[PDB]
């Protein structure tokens, strides 16, 4: 490309490097007939969080001196710099964008780790009883890694029926789908609740929706 300009670069966080790992080359077309040296400045640079990013001086290699997590800091705003052997800046200032991309490396989170609702005894199958919710740090816009997926691993006791309830699997929200709760034989569920990112595909955690059962009047 062109000397003294750089489109945005993309570094997958948690890299396994080698570090310092080389991102790109500055190069000002004034070292045709002067020696230049090159400086980078911002935030990752020489303000916090401060020497993620260098550069080598005379080469003019801007380097990433070790794994990123998109999770800490998602964009870094750099200037490149070029400074004559005599002194004189050389160059205007020159923006690096560094945009820091997803890796699946969080597992959903669920918001309370026990849900409680409640739910009246004789209500038709269908009828919604109370809404969980998982969230997860990575991304949900590109991919599914941020993506969560819910489902009922189990449910106790097992009276009058093994599964009494559903849940919706992308809003977490947890309906009846039979018959027979009555606050005199069960007044209360427990039900082991999961969320999986990779919308399903990827990992589980899990936590618990406890349900009350109400009476009638
Ligand atoms: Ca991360
Ligand atoms: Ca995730
Ligand atoms: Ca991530
Ligand atoms: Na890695
Ligand atoms: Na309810
Ligand atoms: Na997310
Ligand atoms: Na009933």
Do not use: C
């Amino acid at each position: 490309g062109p000397d003294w300009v750089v489109a945005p670069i993309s570094v997958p966080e948690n890299g396994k490097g080698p570090f310092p790992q080389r991102l790109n080359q500055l190069k000002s077309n004034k070292d045709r007939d002067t020696k230049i040296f090159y400086s980078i400045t911002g935030p990752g640079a020489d303000s916090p969080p401060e020497g993620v990013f260098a550069v080598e001086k005379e080469t003019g290699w801007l380097l990433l001196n070790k794994p990123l997590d998109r999770e800490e800091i998602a964009k870094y705003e750099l200037f490149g710099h070029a400074v004559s052997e005599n002194g004189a800046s050389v160059e205007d200032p020159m923006n690096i964008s560094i945009i820091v991309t997803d890796q699946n490396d969080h597992k959903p989170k669920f918001t309370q780790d026990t849900f409680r609702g409640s739910v009246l005894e004789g209500v038709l199958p269908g009828t919604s009883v109370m809404q969980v919710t998982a969230t997860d740090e990575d991304d949900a816009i590109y991919t599914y890694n941020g993506v969560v997926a819910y489902s009922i691993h189990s449910q106790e006791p097992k009276d009058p029926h093994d599964l009494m309830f559903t849940i919706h699997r992308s809003t977490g929200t947890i309906s009846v789908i039979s018959s027979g709760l009555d606050r005199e034989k069960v007044p209360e569920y427990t039900l082991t609740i999961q969320a999986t990112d990779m919308d399903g595909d990827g990992s589980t955690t899990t936590a618990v929706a406890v349900v009350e059962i109400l009476d009638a009047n």
